[PDB]
Amino acid sequence: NSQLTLRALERGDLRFIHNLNNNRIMSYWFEEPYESFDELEELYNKHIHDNAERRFVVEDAQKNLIGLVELIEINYIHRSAEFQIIIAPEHQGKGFARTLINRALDYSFTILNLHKIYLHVAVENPKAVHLYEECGFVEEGHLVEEFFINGRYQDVKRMYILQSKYLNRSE
Amino acid sequence: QLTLRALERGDLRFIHNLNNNRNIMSYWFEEPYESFDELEELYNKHIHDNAERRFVVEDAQKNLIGLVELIEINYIHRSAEFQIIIAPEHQGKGFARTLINRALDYSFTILNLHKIYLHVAVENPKAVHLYEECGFVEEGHLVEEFFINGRYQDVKRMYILQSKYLN
Amino acid sequence: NSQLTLRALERGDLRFIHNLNNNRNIMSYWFEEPYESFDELEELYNKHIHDNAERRFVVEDAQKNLIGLVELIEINYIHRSAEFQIIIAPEHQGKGFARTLINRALDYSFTILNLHKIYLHVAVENPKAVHLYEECGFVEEGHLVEEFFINGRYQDVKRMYILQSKYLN
Amino acid sequence: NSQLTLRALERGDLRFIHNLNNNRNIMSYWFEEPYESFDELEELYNKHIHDNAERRFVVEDAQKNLIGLVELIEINYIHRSAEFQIIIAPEHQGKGFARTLINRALDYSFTILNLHKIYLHVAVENPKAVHLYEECGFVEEGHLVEEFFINGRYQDVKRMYILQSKYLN
Amino acid sequence: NSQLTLRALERGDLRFIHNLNNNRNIMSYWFEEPYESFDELEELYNKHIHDNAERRFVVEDAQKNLIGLVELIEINYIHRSAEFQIIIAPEHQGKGFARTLINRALDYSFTILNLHKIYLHVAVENPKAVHLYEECGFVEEGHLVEEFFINGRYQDVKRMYILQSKYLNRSE
Amino acid sequence: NSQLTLRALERGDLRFIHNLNNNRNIMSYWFEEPYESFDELEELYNKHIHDNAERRFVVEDAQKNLIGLVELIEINYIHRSAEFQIIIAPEHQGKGFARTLINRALDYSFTILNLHKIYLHVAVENPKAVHLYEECGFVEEGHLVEEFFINGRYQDVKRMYILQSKYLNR
Amino acid sequence: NSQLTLRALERGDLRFIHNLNNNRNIMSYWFEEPYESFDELEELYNKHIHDNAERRFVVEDAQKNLIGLVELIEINYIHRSAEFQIIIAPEHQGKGFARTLINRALDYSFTILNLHKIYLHVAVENPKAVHLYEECGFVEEGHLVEEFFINGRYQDVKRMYILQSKYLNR
Amino acid sequence: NSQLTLRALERGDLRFIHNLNNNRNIMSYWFEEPYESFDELEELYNKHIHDNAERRFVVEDAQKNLIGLVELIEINYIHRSAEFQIIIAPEHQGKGFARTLINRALDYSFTILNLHKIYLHVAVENPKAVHLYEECGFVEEGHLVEEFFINGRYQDVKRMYILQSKYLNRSE
Amino acid sequence: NSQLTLRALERGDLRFIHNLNNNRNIMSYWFEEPYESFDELEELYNKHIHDNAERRFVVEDAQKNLIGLVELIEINYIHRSAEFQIIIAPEHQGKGFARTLINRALDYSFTILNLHKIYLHVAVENPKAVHLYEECGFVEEGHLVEEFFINGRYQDVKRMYILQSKYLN
Amino acid sequence: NSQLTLRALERGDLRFIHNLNNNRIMSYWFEEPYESFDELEELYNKHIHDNAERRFVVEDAQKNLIGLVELIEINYIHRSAEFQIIIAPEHQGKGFARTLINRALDYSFTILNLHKIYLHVAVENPKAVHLYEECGFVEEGHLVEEFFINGRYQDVKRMYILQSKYLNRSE
Amino acid sequence: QLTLRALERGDLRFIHNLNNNRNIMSYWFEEPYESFDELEELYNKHIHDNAERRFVVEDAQKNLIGLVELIEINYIHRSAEFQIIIAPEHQGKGFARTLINRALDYSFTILNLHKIYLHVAVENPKAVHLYEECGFVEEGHLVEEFFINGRYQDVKRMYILQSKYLN
Amino acid sequence: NSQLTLRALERGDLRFIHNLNNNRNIMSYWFEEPYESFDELEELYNKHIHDNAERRFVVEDAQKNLIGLVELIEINYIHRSAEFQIIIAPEHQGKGFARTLINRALDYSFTILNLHKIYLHVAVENPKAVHLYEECGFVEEGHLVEEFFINGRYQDVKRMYILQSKYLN
Ligand SMILES: [Ca+2]
Ligand SMILES: [Ca+2]
Ligand SMILES: [Ca+2]
Ligand SMILES: [Ca+2]
Ligand SMILES: [Ca+2]
Ligand SMILES: [Ca+2]
Ligand SMILES: [Ca+2]
Ligand SMILES: [Ca+2]
Ligand SMILES: [Ca+2]
Ligand SMILES: [Ca+2]
Ligand SMILES: [Ca+2]
Ligand SMILES: [Ca+2]
């Protein structure tokens, strides 16, 4: 966790982003759909100045690719963003995520000066829900039949935290 | 008495005139604009993009009544976010429910969407009641989601499924 | 004054902007590029049409007379700040409009754009103007020494600011 | 300490620039456009190579160790002014290089570039830095209230300046 | 004299510029490219519209008659210097407007552009013009031998200059 | 001096040009555009590759040490004139090369390029250099008052010239 | 002849150029590229707008009738020479304009553009035109054998020249 | 003599071309643009690669030593004429290879390009070269007065030509 | 019949060209690319305007009636040859223009363009046309078997030629 | 029918093509999907040199827009194409179609020298089927549940004619 | 023992090598190619186009076994044309049926297609019997559809529905 | 001969094509553009890579020696015709390969590309070659008079053709 680092995504990381798709569902890049890696590469150069989405690669002390932190739908009048996080499967079950959630929130709130961060979790992933609740996220919606995961439509939490809570919880 | 038509370049004026009678930032494919020239340039930029669709609401005499928008259209999960704008002069005439109906009809028989949701300010409880009466149900109470008119404001997220509407 | 409005700037407004910048007799700037001719202005307008670093609004009255311009420049969306300027057309000065325009700029800045801090520069040798901005809620945070070359000599300007917390609640 | 030289920044130095922003934990900007990734930086570098609004110099010693960076930005060539900042790589700090680099910045600014004024921003909460810039001839012309969002809160900065007249007599 | 204004040059004024060349019968230049046809002048104007090394102004009277042209060229913002040239249209020559235009150029150069030095060239075989410039505060700094090929032969020109400190603080 | 050769400047020589520009430690220009970054110089070079208003020669000895640079600028092919400058690397200043190079430059300007006149600028505060130029045939035609901001002050420069006819009918 | 004015060729004049080219009914060229279509001429014109190797003047009277065309081509600014041609519209041939225009052309070449030499070509089978040129100061320097395929056969042309010095020291 | 071949010029031969200029000390041209540096030569080569108004050939021996250069320029396919120029590298001068190269140029010009007339210029103060060309079948058609500025003065050149019918059917 | 002139084809003449292909009921081609629509033709025209492989001339009378078209294609400038064809608008046929236009084609080909050979293709089943080209000096050099697919079947064409030597003595 | 004419489609016709979509289903342009007219205009310039599809506008004596003839999937090694035809609804029921079928076949077989033309007709449009059978088209497939017309999946005939049949039927 | 992988630029060689061991014209997004350079250029041209998709068939050791192609993919009607190519060295080993299965599986559970059809030359009755045995049924006998090896040849069109396969 | 193959032409084959066109000593053409240098060839290759008007095949033997080239040019896909040429490398001539290459070209033309008619040009002054093509099924349809300038004089060529109906059934 002291071992872990965040780093802005670069071209050389696209291979890894594409492997993490393999683990599942579709992937998107600035909300443009892609399947193949050559597609992804083309989409990457196209949106390199686009500020609506930010990605960081997570590595350990020996430069292992651990996972991915994403902020999307960044809107700077509303000062909000959606947060996703993806851990390589050979690196889940080792605690790393809470640390990463903090790093991401810290960045959103101490550097981007965003006001709000929200996310979606599967209702039927009650561990993940509760994990976000522990980091300070509150439920604000139970989205009915939202996403088509594993052969049926499923409900998802949408959960949020605000900047004042993250930054002044301890005052 | 009321039609929907695919929007085209000639309608941009109308759209720009609606954005002004509302006095908040407007978006085109999630990009903000203020001037007509800004809109024109974004219209051209997003001509081939499916993430949003818009229909001009006219009457049998070609008066411009309002606008129907599907944004965040998701073709895998078969959902979209719906908005309506009615021109100031046609507000409070009884067109809103008819347009809601036409739009769900199109969305659920022609676009074959599974879900349609929307956002309504918490501070507009009458819009909220109207959408409840059209069959929408609350699925979220988004806290301080949107900075509107000088402070952050809550919105209800309201939805309807295809299975409900097609009964 | 109630019937004064702000409208986002359009290509057809550029003649007016050029004419305003003409009895001002200092160099004027579009997105930090100096210009003098309408033709260069028009070209800068087309080139920076999607740049969010500056925003401009034409002030009109009830029968659409062109009263003036509001500019926000140096907009930074992390610090949530912007510099601002007002230019009233010379034939509409001294009719009391200024205070209302200042209000409407602040109103846009703080109620639509969600900025935190607006600041401006006023010539030290225009104490009446300074006193005007003080009345609308601005406070001096800087007295910039020989900042601008104006009329053949370097001049001091007061830098004056107001926060969103103050204008709103 | 004459051991230390400036040289104009060029493409091989963008790794260093990137590595320096990594430590600092704020948004960094190339010609007012924000960037995070090396790739964003590289593309920005190529785009603005003909742009004279900002100028940068890498700092090296005898053995060409990469000590730090001098940045002039907001260069205006009618008013003859520029904002400056100075970044020393963490591992070369508190060796008393700052003063020397400040002098080189000023010397370039005033005997090569022919500017009239240089200004900078120093955190109010860093009175040591404020005091260093004072020993080097800078004088405080403002106290900018809640100017920057840094480390989770809005912060005041001193604005400090020196004129070409003072530096050269 | 009194009611003569400087306006930045526009695309519609290129015809005027062109007629002024035509009437004058030496090779002309735009951003150091020689041109003869209007169409080349137009293309050059478009190409160099953001180039700040040259600036041109059109002179008008109250009735909007086109009177003359002021150019600054070779403008350098480190040495803060420029070459200045002025042309009055044939039919407006000999009404003594030149002093008024020279003052406008100097004032723009020194109050709006904040330059340090403005210089110009005058043909040695035009001693009136030399004396005219001397009255307006220019001083000789060179006599440039066979500098220009003009009307079948190389001619000498005076080079003449004035400093911002002099234009601006003479009277202080 | 026998052994001093001129050749046309090339992309490989820009690093040399850049390093010379640094030692002089005044702002330098390519086709009247100022540069400081090697990368900007390089992009100025490509962009102006077909521009004939300036022409530049690297000076080499028999062992291909880089001695200096000869430039003509402001070349005008109607009036047939050009401005000439010469920079010798610091480590070869004072060895006697300068007259030889001036001569090579005059030679090229007047027997190849067919110019009529070549003028240069010399700091008024370097009178030994002014005399050097007089000894090679140049004449003072101007004393340009506060023409260049160089090392923190505006400086006067002699303008000095020679004509084709004089160089050829020697 | 008082009343004959030169002005620089413009886009509006190309229709005139095209119609002249037709009457002569030989293949004609723009910057050494052959054209026949007005549209190709027009696209050759835009493309070569900044090319100084050819320069062209329309000739007008006091009433702005189009009299003819003066061209210089093959302009070389090192050697200071150019090839000169002149076409008079058929309906103004034989009125006495030609000497006046040759003179205007020599005047421009030698007192404005500072060329050293101007040469032209005349069909060997038009000896009255060859004499006309001799009367204006031109001298034969070549008799070019089967140089041009014109009207179904290779034809000989005189090459004729005048120098700046002779035109000026008249 | 016998084992000398013509090969179309390639990008790798530009260095050779360039060294040949360097050694020769007059201004050189590529598609009528003057160049001095290799880098400009390279850019011009790229720009004009489909231009058929000029064609160049490199001369090699059996060991692939670079011997010389043949250019045809001003090629016109209606008059069917071209200007021809030949350059032998300093170190291969005086081995009498010139006749062999001139024959190759004439043969290409007249058998592969099907031109009608090839002409060239020779300095009047090089009467050997004139006589050399005359032996190879060229005839004088002009003595061009002060045509070229070369080594500090204008020089006269012979212009010299040969026709396809003569090269090809002399012997018939 | 000297009344008739050639002039080089240009953009205003593309309606006429298009209207002429409409009658003929075969594929028509611009520089070997097939086209059907005016828009395809226009775009093709612009693309190939600098291409010297084909040349076209519109034919007009005294009153500038649009009589027809002369087309040289496959122009090769080493071998000095070209394929030619001639199209007279339906309403101007059988007035004895063909011969005159054939002569103009040849005259251009051989006294302006300096070609060595001209050839054309005539349908075997049009022995009248074959005979016209014979009266004008053409001689048959081939009988191309099933060369073209026209009106639903493969057809033989005569290939007919004349040389510059013959035309000019 | 003597009154009718075929004419290669041009830019000015795109308005009409777009109105004929109104009558229904999706439309495509060189097998790129389009909805809006501004989309169609952009797609039109893009494929203007593309030879795989040919369209003709049908007009009457007074320039009325009657309908549309399309050849798509034109392949010139196999020498085949798919044929569609669309009549404006205010102009159906007037016989015009058989004439148009002939004009299209004539063009395919006398000018393009194609070998085969095929088409699809709804199985549940037995009149249209029989209409094509009368023009010389033979069934070669009954495509099961092929296209989703009016709320269920429907069967379609694929029918063909060859060049030798069209051209030599009478020999 | 056998995988499917999305095709990428590195696979072009393999594809080009398969096209050669077949000796008929090959197509990429309906455009013909012969050379590798031609293919490369078409690959780049169609990177963003959904009308076709291809999967490289590898084994657990990374040997290249063959290719699975969906072309004429129709996202409205939810159909596609399917082809398989097996590298010459792996023909007649019993991989074909497994690959058919994998491809229908992907098409009908992951791509959620309604229909998959194919073409098989009439003169290859054993391929026809093989596809019948995998569940495909004839829906057409396309007459002289394809010019292959010097004459026009008939093909069967054979199909399977999602409803059949998912029992 | 059985072990001779055709392979579609690749960029790396261009050296071979250039070398073949070199001991031929007549002007050679890529898509009707003349060329002489490899560099121009390479550039023409890139430019016409998607043009279907010409197709080329390299002939190799069992151990991939480069034997020769087959070209189809002037391909028209409505008339279904093409012109063809064969060039065997000088070190592989007179080894009996020609007849097989001719067969394989025809085979491609008629069994893969579905052309109707292939034709070629053969110098009248190469009667052995004419006799060769006659043996593979070609028939004279034209004797083209002074078609090509070759070796300093105009030359006759036989045009010789074969139909798909003849090669196949
Ligand atoms: Ca979105
Ligand atoms: Ca400017
Ligand atoms: Ca700024
Ligand atoms: Ca020019
Ligand atoms: Ca610069
Ligand atoms: Ca200059
Ligand atoms: Ca042409
Ligand atoms: Ca020339
Ligand atoms: Ca050059
Ligand atoms: Ca298809
Ligand atoms: Ca070529
Ligand atoms: Ca051809």
mmCIF file of C-alpha atoms in Angstrom, chain F residues 4 11 13-14 20 25 36-38 43 46 51 57 66 69 99-100 103 113 117 132 144 147 150 154-155 157 164-165:
data_model
loop_
_atom_site.group_PDB
_atom_site.id
_atom_site.type_symbol
_atom_site.label_atom_id
_atom_site.label_comp_id
_atom_site.label_asym_id
_atom_site.label_seq_id
_atom_site.Cartn_x
_atom_site.Cartn_y
_atom_site.Cartn_z
ATOM 1 C CA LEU F 4 39.750 26.821 -44.300
ATOM 2 C CA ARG F 11 20.729 19.535 -40.505
ATOM 3 C CA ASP F 13 25.273 21.343 -38.176
ATOM 4 C CA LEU F 14 22.361 22.812 -36.180
ATOM 5 C CA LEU F 20 27.464 29.028 -30.790
ATOM 6 C CA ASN F 25 24.319 34.574 -25.006
ATOM 7 C CA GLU F 36 16.042 29.409 -28.046
ATOM 8 C CA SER F 37 15.124 25.718 -28.021
ATOM 9 C CA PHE F 38 17.148 23.483 -30.393
ATOM 10 C CA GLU F 43 11.514 23.284 -36.888
ATOM 11 C CA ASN F 46 12.622 22.569 -42.093
ATOM 12 C CA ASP F 51 13.604 30.259 -48.503
ATOM 13 C CA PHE F 57 27.944 28.265 -44.360
ATOM 14 C CA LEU F 66 34.053 23.431 -36.660
ATOM 15 C CA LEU F 69 29.619 30.249 -39.274
ATOM 16 C CA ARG F 99 40.061 37.923 -42.505
ATOM 17 C CA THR F 100 40.256 34.733 -44.483
ATOM 18 C CA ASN F 103 37.222 37.143 -47.848
ATOM 19 C CA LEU F 113 25.624 35.129 -56.044
ATOM 20 C CA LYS F 117 26.576 45.333 -51.928
ATOM 21 C CA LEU F 132 39.487 45.082 -38.810
ATOM 22 C CA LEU F 144 22.912 53.360 -35.646
ATOM 23 C CA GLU F 147 19.686 49.833 -32.314
ATOM 24 C CA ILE F 150 22.299 43.533 -25.949
ATOM 25 C CA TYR F 154 20.472 49.602 -26.049
ATOM 26 C CA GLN F 155 23.722 49.815 -28.052
ATOM 27 C CA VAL F 157 26.379 49.774 -33.998
ATOM 28 C CA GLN F 164 30.934 44.403 -55.682
ATOM 29 C CA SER F 165 32.836 46.783 -58.013
#
